[PDB]
Amino acid sequence: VSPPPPIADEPLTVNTGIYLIECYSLDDKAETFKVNAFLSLSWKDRRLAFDPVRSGVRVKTYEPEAIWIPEIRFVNVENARDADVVDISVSPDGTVQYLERFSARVLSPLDFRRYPFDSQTLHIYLIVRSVDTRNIVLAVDLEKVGKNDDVFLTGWDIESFTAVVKPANFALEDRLESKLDYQLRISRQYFSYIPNIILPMLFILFISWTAFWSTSYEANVTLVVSTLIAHIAFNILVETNLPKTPYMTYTGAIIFMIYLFYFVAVIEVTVQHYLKVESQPARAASITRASRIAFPVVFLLANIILAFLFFG
Amino acid sequence: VSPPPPIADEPLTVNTGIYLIECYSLDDKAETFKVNAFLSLSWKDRRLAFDPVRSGVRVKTYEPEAIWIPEIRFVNVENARDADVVDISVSPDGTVQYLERFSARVLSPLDFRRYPFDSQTLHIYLIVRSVDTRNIVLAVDLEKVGKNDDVFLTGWDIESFTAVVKPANFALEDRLESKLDYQLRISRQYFSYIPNIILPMLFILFISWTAFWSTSYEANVTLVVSTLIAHIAFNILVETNLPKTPYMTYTGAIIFMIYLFYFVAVIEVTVQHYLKVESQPARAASITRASRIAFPVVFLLANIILAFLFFG
Amino acid sequence: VSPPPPIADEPLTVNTGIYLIECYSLDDKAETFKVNAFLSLSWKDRRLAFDPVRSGVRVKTYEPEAIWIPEIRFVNVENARDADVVDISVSPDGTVQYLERFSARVLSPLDFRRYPFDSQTLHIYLIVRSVDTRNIVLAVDLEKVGKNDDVFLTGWDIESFTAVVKPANFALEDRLESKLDYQLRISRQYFSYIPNIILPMLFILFISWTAFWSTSYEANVTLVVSTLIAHIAFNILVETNLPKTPYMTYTGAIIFMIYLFYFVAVIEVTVQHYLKVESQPARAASITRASRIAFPVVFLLANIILAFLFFG
Amino acid sequence: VSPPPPIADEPLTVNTGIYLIECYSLDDKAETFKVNAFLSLSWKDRRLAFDPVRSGVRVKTYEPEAIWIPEIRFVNVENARDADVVDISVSPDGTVQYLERFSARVLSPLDFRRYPFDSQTLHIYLIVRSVDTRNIVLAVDLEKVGKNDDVFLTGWDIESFTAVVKPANFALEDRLESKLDYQLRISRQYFSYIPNIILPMLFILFISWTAFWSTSYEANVTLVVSTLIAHIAFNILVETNLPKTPYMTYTGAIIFMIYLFYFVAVIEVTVQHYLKVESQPARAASITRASRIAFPVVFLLANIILAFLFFG
Amino acid sequence: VSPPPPIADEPLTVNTGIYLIECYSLDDKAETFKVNAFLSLSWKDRRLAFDPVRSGVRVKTYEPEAIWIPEIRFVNVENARDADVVDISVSPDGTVQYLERFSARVLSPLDFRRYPFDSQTLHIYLIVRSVDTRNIVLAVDLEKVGKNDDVFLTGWDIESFTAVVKPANFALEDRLESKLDYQLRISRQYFSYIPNIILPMLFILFISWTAFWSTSYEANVTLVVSTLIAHIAFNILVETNLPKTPYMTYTGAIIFMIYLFYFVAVIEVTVQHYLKVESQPARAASITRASRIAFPVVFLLANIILAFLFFG
């Protein structure tokens, strides 16, 4: 039908609010996730009001087809949402209440630069279609914004869920004042990563570092190269969960540094054996005794530098 | 169509019932499962009443779009259920019989705190929103709740499928709702895990422990490091199908313990070689003879303590 | 658009029939398969007795709409079939002819007790629900049951496709239903499994056994442990196919036996070295010479016993 | 609206034609691929004609729904094609032009017996629905068949695309029916296999064959067994892109040959060491000298014999 | 419902334009990328021009249907787009404004000759069919073609999104069609590839090379073969991504060169041992002294030549 008359001079306001029910399947490679929530809606329409004389219930219902309901669209969704109209009730004072239940698939960016200890924010954008007669603006009601007690994400924990009235849509066609942003702040659960990833890597490195206490060339070669193979194998477990990020990461820096340390250890073993063959054992002993202390200290300093760089 | 006439003394009640046909596709990483089942409803409409007189022996059977059907939805589903109506019958007394068949995908948490020998409970929720004229509450028909004898799940065995008879009424978004709970208790079939996982790891550990009866350095190093690599590969296989958790599991604790044991064995081999080279063979012999007994006993005690801690 | 009236109390019969066109995508882990075929029906409706003498000359052909067609469903399917009607024709006496083409994904359990050389049976179930005013039964018409010679399953031999004539009538949800069973017997092609799996395993086992002719500890350790690692990798490649089962299969038994043999070989090598160190070469020589004959004989005996146990 | 009257002496002939647009997703596990093309029909109907007088300048006419259109359905398709009519024109004589555009999934067998150097043939089948009034027989049209130069399949090159008639001696259809065959010939480009999968394996085998130029038992054992492990790893790599096939293959024969050669090499090394320890060095030298020449010649001859057994 | 009538012989032109919103899921093996964007159309239709003075309106809209809208279809898509009309508006002179929102999966070939540092161009094609006697041609509105500044793709740098203004007219199926081309130019981000793939490979190669400063045969064999195994594992990791291409890429050539280098290193070690055994230490010393310098220089020259060949 027709929109409400613009006889009222003030712009038409459509209050809004989303109530989350569940969020699931947050893919990391395509950075896409799904939602299932309640979409509430309300606006004032003085054209179709109600008087208490008809009945004392003070409540009347209507149909989706007979009453003009403004069209609200989602910006970043793969496909249009699935609408299931629930209930509408018209107060005697003209205010209407509109409900819907929808499910969607949302595209949002993710920043994996502190991958084990990162926090992400997921956005949902709302726009409206301007009507010919009057002016349509949006608003947020803090009462209709919330999340259920049974919202869970596998591996994450939800922190909060708010909204803003930002009318700052990128200018395309007369919609540069009719946007809305909903923010979902989440954090990753990182405790399981310690005993599953970090400590075995340190154990393998320390195993390979025992070559500085022996002078047998064959045993040193076996130790170092076999531990290198074990490190390459452990990279497979490191990779089977972490995404295929085409950019720098904390874990990537750690792995590259580990490769560098293995190379330097091989060089040290080679030079020690070569010096010992040339009837210069004192220099070889001095070099290996220096390396015994040099290696862990440099490893710890590089760890500290990297941690300060990425988290500060 | 309009709701049944408000008798102004009692809210409308609806008696539900779910009959399982088969369950399948219990995803472990996403904690989902798929269902196929019946759904039968029943309530009282004061109208549509007719006596058996005037050829009324044939009970009436209307069609959708001609009567009033309550909207009943599942809370924890990815998408709205795909359903098709089977039969609708109206008794001469005034009640109505309703049947339906649906398929759906359900989200439910899982608890892998005892992962090889765990038990899980799965939930299905039914909700209904009170209309603007009449209140609606739910009920349970205990003779229409059950499962086929042919309901099989791959990897699990089914124990019970009941329904809690007490709805949890509450008010949400300025309207009153009633929620039902269905519980499907299952247990895991753990027989396949023993000879495929547990025994080979024990064999590999016992193989790596043979280095205490030897005295050559190269053979000891080869044995221990190669067995460590084999353990890493078995860890690959084990963790290929186990989701990450915020708590500490059983298998993760055991795997970390075995990593610690390998590290300590490497340390002991290095110490023995270093002592032997420095011309103190008696001390090295005493150390290795002590370790021969010390290792299995400590392993046994640690395993027993862990089993008591988790399953106590 | 209403069920035909019975004469006095007799029920109505429908003669079904399925003609396979192609089977594909047989999953072991999911225990499903796909199929598309023809569904043929025929029943009696005497409200439409055609008279060719005066009212027309040719028998009537109808359209899917505005004609009473029995509802037919499949019990063990994930979702409802996607069927397109082909033709409906009415004979002068009153018997209706019907055809349609459909597809679905069928669920049926499998048996893996003889996995390399196992034979399976697959079931498809039809059903129909009795209306209040009429009772409906099902029947088989053997002239429309069959399969195309082009029906090919990748990796299986199709033997027969028959139906059990006698239905199974039962009362479910306070109504009478009838059920039909279609059995499709298939057998696995096992020749590809011999060179791909069986023989490399034997070659690696013999390579491991070749260590009883050597007297060097380092070489024996290298041989046995490297062959164990190769066996672990091949076990991973094999196990990527067979799902976990509550019972014990054949391949699992053979793999466990091979692990046992590896453990015993390691123990033998360790004992031989330990005895040789103590200046008792006679005992070590006797032990290794006895093992040279003991190992293959026991392997052969164990394999024969297992083959008799599982296939007898 | 009505089938054409059987007025002409010969039955009703339709001129068909398929014009490919692009192809993609040639899945090999399911032996299926998707298509996108045009479907142009043509038939004659003297019943309605547009004589060139009385404003008969309109050569063609547009009849979307008030005209008879034969039902053309595919045979080997998972689901019904997604077709939408493009153009409908009626010539003044009576010949009718028809045209659509469809997308579908095809099920055609694949044969990987010469996998690196194989060729395939993909079939698409067309059948027509008979009508009691007039007989309908399919007929190809040479000018309406073809394909774009913009078709492409990843890893394949297209040789030809033609059509031929094929009587339908199948489907047990009690009515007379006709079928059409469309054949697409594709040859795989094998160039990217010689430097990717073949030559590295030759290099690994030749590396393993250098154990015949040494007398050190430990070095020979390490060489041969580590190269066997490398062969297993390369087999794991190769398994990435090959199909999971249930029959014999050329590549499988090559892999089995390589395993056999590794076994024989280990046996030779053991024999040489056993003879050398037994104070018979001349025999060991003779055996090694024989092996140096024997191994490559036998490998080449067996490869020639396998290449003759296949490919002919 | 009817195409606009021509004046005498002139054709009808429609002005198009695509405003990008977001691109994602750029599959390299399948060579597809999903997309969703605004689509705009505009054309002149004088059969429904109005009088602004009498009607009292300055813009006139219509329902989504009940007006003649040209059929615009994409050529290289897997299926028809998921259209969503947003607005139809008309100008007083007769021009029709139009909007639409869609999403689709496109097909486009790629070039992988410079895979780490390559740039690609993606194509979107639009076509229209000539209905009636009114020829239809396309045109580009330069102020509507654009891209959102938030259009992002993971790992790619987006340079431009332009269109070729001149269409291409050709006769398909004895009918004329006009085609437009939309080009999206992107370049790959290569920084993450260097520390992930390039440098570990070099470190492993240098670890292999360190064997020219040694004399012990067992240590050299262990070093070279273990580094070869690690190289095979990294080959697995890299081959996970790249598809099969009929031509030779940069990475494939580099990998083959590395394989050849490993083979030559094994040969050199073998010949050094063979010469030293025959009591000729001087020749072996000279050979190894030469090889120490010879290997890195040859590697550098080969890399330089490859870089000049593929980029010159």
Coordinates of N, CA, C and O in Angstrom, one line a residue, chain B residues 94-161:
Chain B
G94 N -14.3 -32.1 18.8 CA -13.8 -30.8 18.6 C -12.3 -30.7 18.4 O -11.7 -29.7 17.9
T95 N -11.6 -31.7 18.9 CA -10.1 -31.8 18.8 C -9.7 -32.0 17.3 O -10.5 -32.4 16.5
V96 N -8.4 -31.8 17.1 CA -7.8 -31.9 15.7 C -6.5 -32.8 15.8 O -5.8 -32.6 16.8
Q97 N -6.4 -33.7 14.9 CA -5.2 -34.5 14.8 C -4.3 -34.1 13.6 O -4.8 -33.9 12.5
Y98 N -3.0 -33.9 13.9 CA -2.1 -33.3 12.9 C -0.8 -34.1 12.8 O -0.3 -34.6 13.8
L99 N -0.4 -34.4 11.6 CA 0.8 -35.2 11.4 C 1.7 -34.5 10.4 O 1.3 -33.7 9.5
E100 N 3.0 -34.7 10.5 CA 4.0 -34.1 9.7 C 5.3 -34.9 9.7 O 5.5 -35.7 10.6
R101 N 6.1 -34.7 8.6 CA 7.4 -35.4 8.5 C 8.5 -34.3 8.1 O 8.3 -33.6 7.2
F102 N 9.6 -34.3 8.8 CA 10.6 -33.3 8.6 C 12.0 -33.9 8.7 O 12.2 -35.0 9.2
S103 N 13.0 -33.1 8.2 CA 14.4 -33.3 8.3 C 15.1 -32.0 8.7 O 14.6 -30.9 8.3
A104 N 16.1 -32.1 9.5 CA 16.7 -30.9 10.0 C 18.2 -31.2 10.4 O 18.6 -32.3 10.5
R105 N 19.0 -30.1 10.6 CA 20.3 -30.2 11.1 C 20.4 -29.4 12.4 O 20.0 -28.2 12.5
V106 N 20.9 -30.1 13.4 CA 20.8 -29.6 14.8 C 22.2 -29.3 15.3 O 23.2 -30.0 15.1
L107 N 22.4 -28.2 16.1 CA 23.6 -27.8 16.7 C 23.5 -28.1 18.2 O 22.5 -27.7 18.9
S108 N 24.5 -28.7 18.8 CA 24.5 -29.0 20.2 C 26.0 -29.2 20.7 O 26.8 -29.7 20.0
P109 N 26.3 -28.7 21.9 CA 27.6 -28.8 22.4 C 28.0 -30.2 22.7 O 27.2 -31.1 23.0
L110 N 29.3 -30.5 22.7 CA 29.9 -31.8 23.1 C 31.0 -31.6 24.1 O 31.6 -30.5 24.1
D111 N 31.2 -32.6 25.0 CA 32.2 -32.5 26.1 C 33.2 -33.6 25.9 O 32.9 -34.8 26.3
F112 N 34.3 -33.3 25.4 CA 35.4 -34.3 25.2 C 36.4 -34.3 26.4 O 37.6 -34.3 26.2
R113 N 35.9 -34.4 27.6 CA 36.8 -34.4 28.8 C 37.3 -35.8 29.0 O 38.3 -36.0 29.7
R114 N 36.6 -36.8 28.5 CA 37.0 -38.2 28.6 C 36.9 -38.9 27.2 O 36.3 -39.9 27.0
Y115 N 37.6 -38.2 26.2 CA 37.2 -38.4 24.8 C 37.1 -39.9 24.3 O 36.1 -40.2 23.7
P116 N 38.1 -40.7 24.6 CA 37.9 -42.1 24.1 C 36.7 -42.8 24.7 O 36.1 -43.7 24.1
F117 N 36.3 -42.5 26.0 CA 35.3 -43.2 26.7 C 34.3 -42.3 27.3 O 33.9 -42.3 28.4
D118 N 33.8 -41.4 26.4 CA 32.9 -40.3 26.8 C 31.4 -40.7 26.5 O 31.1 -41.6 25.7
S119 N 30.5 -39.9 27.2 CA 29.1 -40.0 26.9 C 28.5 -38.6 26.7 O 29.0 -37.7 27.3
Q120 N 27.6 -38.5 25.8 CA 27.1 -37.2 25.4 C 25.5 -37.2 25.4 O 24.9 -38.3 25.3
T121 N 25.0 -36.0 25.6 CA 23.5 -35.8 25.5 C 23.2 -34.8 24.5 O 23.8 -33.7 24.5
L122 N 22.2 -35.0 23.6 CA 21.9 -34.2 22.6 C 20.5 -33.6 22.8 O 19.6 -34.3 23.3
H123 N 20.3 -32.3 22.5 CA 19.1 -31.6 22.8 C 18.3 -31.1 21.6 O 19.0 -30.7 20.6
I124 N 17.0 -31.2 21.6 CA 16.1 -30.6 20.6 C 15.1 -29.8 21.3 O 14.4 -30.3 22.2
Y125 N 15.0 -28.5 20.9 CA 14.1 -27.6 21.5 C 12.9 -27.2 20.6 O 13.1 -27.1 19.4
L126 N 11.7 -27.1 21.2 CA 10.5 -26.6 20.5 C 10.0 -25.4 21.2 O 9.9 -25.3 22.4
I127 N 9.6 -24.4 20.4 CA 9.1 -23.1 20.9 C 7.9 -22.7 20.2 O 7.6 -23.2 19.1
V128 N 7.1 -21.9 20.9 CA 5.9 -21.3 20.3 C 5.6 -19.9 20.9 O 5.7 -19.8 22.1
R129 N 5.3 -19.0 20.1 CA 5.1 -17.6 20.5 C 3.6 -17.3 20.7 O 2.8 -17.6 19.7
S130 N 3.2 -16.8 21.8 CA 1.8 -16.5 22.1 C 1.3 -15.5 21.1 O 1.9 -14.5 20.9
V131 N 0.1 -15.7 20.5 CA -0.5 -14.8 19.6 C -1.1 -13.6 20.4 O -1.2 -13.7 21.6
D132 N -1.5 -12.6 19.7 CA -1.9 -11.3 20.3 C -3.3 -11.4 21.0 O -3.7 -10.5 21.7
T133 N -4.0 -12.5 20.7 CA -5.3 -12.7 21.3 C -5.3 -13.8 22.4 O -6.0 -13.6 23.4
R134 N -4.6 -14.8 22.3 CA -4.6 -16.0 23.2 C -3.2 -16.4 23.6 O -2.3 -16.3 22.8
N135 N -3.1 -16.9 24.8 CA -1.8 -17.5 25.2 C -1.8 -19.0 24.8 O -2.8 -19.7 24.7
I136 N -0.6 -19.5 24.5 CA -0.3 -20.8 24.1 C 0.8 -21.4 24.9 O 1.8 -20.8 25.1
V137 N 0.5 -22.6 25.4 CA 1.5 -23.4 26.2 C 1.6 -24.8 25.6 O 0.7 -25.3 25.0
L138 N 2.8 -25.4 25.8 CA 3.1 -26.7 25.2 C 2.9 -27.8 26.3 O 2.8 -27.6 27.5
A139 N 2.8 -29.0 25.7 CA 2.7 -30.2 26.6 C 3.4 -31.4 25.9 O 3.8 -31.2 24.7
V140 N 3.4 -32.5 26.5 CA 4.1 -33.7 26.0 C 3.1 -34.9 26.0 O 2.4 -35.1 27.0
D141 N 3.0 -35.6 24.9 CA 2.3 -36.8 24.7 C 3.2 -38.0 24.8 O 4.0 -38.2 23.9
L142 N 3.2 -38.7 26.0 CA 4.2 -39.7 26.3 C 4.1 -41.0 25.4 O 5.0 -41.8 25.4
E143 N 3.0 -41.2 24.8 CA 2.8 -42.3 24.0 C 3.1 -42.1 22.5 O 3.0 -43.0 21.7
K144 N 3.5 -40.9 22.1 CA 4.0 -40.6 20.8 C 5.4 -40.2 20.7 O 5.8 -39.5 19.7
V145 N 6.2 -40.6 21.7 CA 7.6 -40.3 21.7 C 8.4 -41.6 21.7 O 8.2 -42.4 22.6
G146 N 9.3 -41.7 20.7 CA 10.0 -43.0 20.6 C 10.9 -43.0 19.4 O 11.1 -41.9 18.8
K147 N 11.4 -44.1 19.1 CA 12.3 -44.3 18.0 C 12.1 -45.6 17.3 O 11.6 -46.6 17.9
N148 N 12.5 -45.7 16.0 CA 12.5 -47.0 15.3 C 13.6 -47.9 15.9 O 14.6 -47.5 16.5
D149 N 13.3 -49.2 15.8 CA 14.3 -50.2 16.2 C 15.5 -50.2 15.3 O 16.5 -50.8 15.6
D150 N 15.4 -49.6 14.1 CA 16.4 -49.6 13.1 C 17.2 -48.3 13.1 O 18.0 -48.0 12.2
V151 N 17.0 -47.4 14.1 CA 17.8 -46.2 14.3 C 19.2 -46.5 14.6 O 19.5 -47.0 15.8
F152 N 20.1 -46.3 13.7 CA 21.5 -46.6 13.9 C 22.3 -45.4 13.7 O 22.0 -44.5 12.8
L153 N 23.4 -45.2 14.5 CA 24.4 -44.2 14.3 C 25.8 -44.8 14.1 O 26.1 -45.8 14.8
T154 N 26.5 -44.3 13.2 CA 27.9 -44.8 12.9 C 28.8 -44.4 14.0 O 29.2 -43.2 14.0
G155 N 29.3 -45.3 14.8 CA 30.2 -45.0 15.9 C 29.7 -44.9 17.3 O 30.4 -44.9 18.2
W156 N 28.4 -44.7 17.4 CA 27.7 -44.6 18.7 C 26.6 -45.6 18.8 O 26.1 -46.2 17.8
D157 N 26.2 -45.8 20.1 CA 25.0 -46.6 20.4 C 24.0 -45.8 21.2 O 24.4 -45.1 22.1
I158 N 22.7 -45.9 20.8 CA 21.7 -45.1 21.4 C 21.2 -45.8 22.7 O 21.1 -47.0 22.7
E159 N 20.9 -45.0 23.7 CA 20.4 -45.5 25.0 C 19.0 -45.1 25.3 O 18.2 -46.0 25.6
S160 N 18.6 -43.8 25.1 CA 17.2 -43.4 25.4 C 16.9 -42.2 24.6 O 17.8 -41.4 24.1
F161 N 15.6 -41.9 24.5 CA 15.1 -40.7 23.8 C 13.8 -40.3 24.6 O 12.7 -40.9 24.3

